[PDB]
């Protein structure tokens, strides 16, 4: 089906504590495959997935050279923004940037992204047309004008529609074992009395990939949206994900409740019932 490649950059100023921190990570779908950390000893882009380790030194040296240029650029940006917002030299601030591409189930370019945040708020974003910018405030409108005058969107468009998707397709094929797979959730229910007249039923989805999943509880086929505790989908640490959904049920009424699990790795959506 559909796939994505995304890169995430975080730059954090550390006044009087030396150079800003810079962390870059890259993902294909929900699988991280590279990292760079300004504070690490290697000062190189590093593999974080087995399939990318097969790329040669030209790849690693190239990604290293380019990610260092990204780092330097963000070091500059932190100073620029401080100026734009008339902020003290003393405070720590954060620049984030994300960019990448989606391809559809045909593996052709579908969508491109390129956006920045400053101190956790949208700053500037390339619009879906890959030709125009959304500037979040007055400061960002300065950047927007500058990038319009330098024709940055055109250069980004060419990467997002071209080279980005070419990389993505290469990685999908090279890491086919890791990337073109689904791991179906292993499911189970637990039951725990909360009192003499109540029990929590918890529906578990474990060891699944990709992260996208829907866990829902029904009582007599009616969705219990407002009464379900749903935890954020969380990484197992091995490349798979976990999630649970619970309802507190009147003891004796277990048989009324069904948990429904939808996941790409499933032949059919699953229905679990206690008993």
């Amino acid at each position: 089906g559909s796939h994505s490649m995304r890169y995430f950059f975080t730059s954090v100023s550390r006044p009087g504590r030396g150079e800003p921190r810079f962390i870059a990570v890259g993902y294909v779908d929900d699988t991280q495959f590279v990292r760079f950390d300004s504070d690490a000893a290697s000062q190189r882009m590093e593999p974080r997935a087995p399939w990318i380790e097969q790329e040669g030194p030209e790849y690693w040296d190239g990604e290293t050279r380019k990610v260092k240029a990204h780092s330097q650029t963000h070091r500059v940006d932190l100073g620029t923004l401080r100026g734009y917002y008339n902020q003290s030299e003393a405070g720590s601030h954060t620049v984030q940037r994300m960019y990448g591409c989606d391809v559809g189930s045909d593996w052709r370019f579908l969508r491109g992204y390129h956006q920045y945040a400053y101190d956790g708020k949208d700053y500037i974003a390339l619009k879906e047309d890959l030709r125009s910018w959304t500037a979040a405030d007055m400061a960002a409108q300065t950047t927007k004008h500058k990038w319009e005058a330098a024709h940055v969107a055109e250069q980004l468009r060419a990467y997002l529609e071209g080279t980005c998707v070419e990389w993505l397709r290469r990685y999908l094929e090279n890491g086919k074992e890791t990337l073109q797979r689904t791991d179906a959730p292993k499911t189970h229910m637990t039951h725990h009395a909360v009192s003499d007249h109540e029990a929590t039923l918890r529906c578990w989805a474990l060891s699944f990939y990709p992260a996208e999943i829907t866990l829902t509880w029904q009582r007599d086929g009616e969705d219990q949206t407002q009464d379900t505790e749903l935890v954020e989908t969380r990484p197992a640490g091995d490349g798979t994900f976990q999630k649970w959904a619970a309802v507190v049920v009147p003891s004796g009424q277990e048989q009324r409740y069904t948990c429904h699990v939808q996941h790409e790795g499933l032949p059919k959506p699953l229905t679990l019932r206690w008993e």
């Binding site: 990570v25 950390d37 974080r48 601030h93 954060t94 637990t190 969380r234 990484p235 197992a236 640490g237």
Partner: protein
């Protein structure tokens, strides 16, 4: 400026079975800014050999990290995750419950 409090989940990679090797995880997510302190505790004491994932963030810009360590659960050993962040007045301790 924006400050978002970490969500905290403490859990094992695989189902806990006493005497069987596993990983203890503490997943912190939804937070901003990125400076955060996370410890894994065994019977109240800091575990020394703790790694974490590379800082990344969600579509809404909030950060997430997985902290983890190899461990072998037993019946008696208690585990917890202890998190501090600008949004917390004191460290938040979340206990591991082997069915959560």
């Amino acid at each position: 400026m924006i400050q978002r409090t970490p969500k905290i989940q403490v859990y094992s990679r695989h189902p806990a079975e006493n005497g069987k090797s596993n990983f203890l995880n503490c997943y912190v997510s939804g937070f901003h800014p990125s400076d955060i302190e996370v410890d894994l505790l065994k019977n109240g004491e800091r575990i020394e050999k703790v790694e974490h994932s590379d800082l990344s963030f969600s579509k809404d810009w909030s950060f997430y990290l997985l902290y983890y360590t190899e461990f072998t659960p037993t019946e008696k050993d208690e585990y917890a995750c202890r998190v501090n962040h600008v949004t917390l007045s004191q460290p938040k301790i979340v206990k591991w419950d082997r069915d959560m």
